[PDB]
Amino acid sequence: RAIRPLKLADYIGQPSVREQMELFIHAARGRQEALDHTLIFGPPGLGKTTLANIIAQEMGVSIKSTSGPVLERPGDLAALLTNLEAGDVLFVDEIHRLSPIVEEVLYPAMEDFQLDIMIGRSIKLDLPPFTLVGATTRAGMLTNPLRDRFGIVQRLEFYNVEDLATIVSRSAGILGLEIEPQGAAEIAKRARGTPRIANRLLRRVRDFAEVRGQGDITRVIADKALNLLDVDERGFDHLDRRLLLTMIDKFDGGPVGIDNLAAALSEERHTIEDVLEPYLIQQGYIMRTPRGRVVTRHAYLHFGLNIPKRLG
Numbered sequence: 001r002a003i004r005p006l007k008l009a010d011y012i013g014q015p016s017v018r019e020q021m022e023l024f025i026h027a028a029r030g031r032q033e034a035l036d037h038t039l040i041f042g043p044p045g046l047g048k049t050t051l052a053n054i055i056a057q058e059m060g061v062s063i064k065s066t067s068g069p070v071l072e073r074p075g076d077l078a079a080l081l082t083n084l085e086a087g088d089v090l091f092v093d094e095i096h097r098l099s100p101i102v103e104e105v106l107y108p109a110m111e112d113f114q115l116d117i118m119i120g121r122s123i124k125l126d127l128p129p130f131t132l133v134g135a136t137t138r139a140g141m142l143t144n145p146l147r148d149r150f151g152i153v154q155r156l157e158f159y160n161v162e163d164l165a166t167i168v169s170r171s172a173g174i175l176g177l178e179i180e181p182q183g184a185a186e187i188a189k190r191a192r193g194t195p196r197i198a199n200r201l202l203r204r205v206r207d208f209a210e211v212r213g214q215g216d217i218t219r220v221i222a223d224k225a226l227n228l229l230d231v232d233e234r235g236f237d238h239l240d241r242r243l244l245l246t247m248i249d250k251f252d253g254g255p256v257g258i259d260n261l262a263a264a265l266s267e268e269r270h271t272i273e274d275v276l277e278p279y280l281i282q283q284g285y286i287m288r289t290p291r292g293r294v295v296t297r298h299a300y301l302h303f304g305l306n307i308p309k310r311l312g
């Protein structure tokens with residue numbers, strides 16, 4: 001009863017990514033080689049970890065999962081690399097958070113299948129072929145050397161509402177739930193472009209339907225459930241609305257720099273930049289400028305506020 005895709009045939013709504021990865025995986029298997037190192041980037045919840053695990057599943061190999069911050073010293077990486085079997089996937093989430101010195105170990109491992117680490121003497125060791133799968137919230141914060149060493153680069157974008165409905169409908173089928181097409185669309189419309197949120201919202205709407213309705217997912221059941229969850233009709237939660245209202249109230253709409261906003265919210269810089277902003281920017285509620293972030297007129301309109309008429 002698991003809803004996370006395990007094979008590439010169940011990876012809905014990124015047709016270019018799936019058609020490309022199907023091809024490169026089939027070719028690499030055909031040669032009995034490891035897949036070329038693969039970089040997957042885009043906002044969180046889009047399916048980067050999911051895709052990393054599908055790669056290992058379709059290649060028929062093991063995946064060791066790790067993260068940038070988990071690797072404090074070069075030897076932390078070296079121990080993972082020397083425990084890999086030939087063809088295994090080494091998945092490094094948040095790969096941009098590798099310290100500059102730990103990332104230096106990665107260049108010859110990826111390029112030459114060799115480990116070159118200091119201990120002061122340098123030691124050089126042969127590594128078996130393997131696939132480094134890196135993921136990051138967007139590729140621009142990688143160094144040129146690391147970025148250029150990936151042979152395959154996949155870009156994940158926010159999903160459109162029709163593909164989210166398809167994912168919601170498929171998950172409701174796997175969960176054994178009756179769902180009307182308009183119920184799938186109501187969740188999809190308010191799921192913030194993300195399959196992770198759409199699936200989580202489906203699980204909570206199912207609870208509402210089972211305790212308060214008749215067990216099946218309808219548009220009205222979905223709406224009431226999402227209202228109870230405090231997710232509005234654009235998919236904004238309490239933090240999204242607080243971000244916009246802080247910019248409007250405390251900063252007159254902006255421009256406001258990212259440090260000022262993080263302080264005024266008591267959130268970290270990276271959660272604004274990576275978790276909150278990218279959907280709000282894609283949908284036209286916030287703009288970046290060299291002087292800072294500004295809200296657009298659509299942020300005012302969304303809350304039923306008068307649009308200010310001033311000068312910049």
Ligand SMILES: Nc1ncnc2c1ncn2[C@@H]1O[C@H](COP(=O)(O)OP(=O)(O)O)[C@@H](O)[C@H]1O
Pocket residue numbers: 003004005010011012013014043044045046047048049050051167195196199
């Ligand atoms: N293409 C897709 N089709 C269906 N479900 C997906 C897809 N991509 C991701 N998911 C779902 O989204 C959720 C989170 O995905 P994840 O791989 O953790 O995203 P990321 O690592 O990019 O934050 C999982 O429950 C998975 O079921």
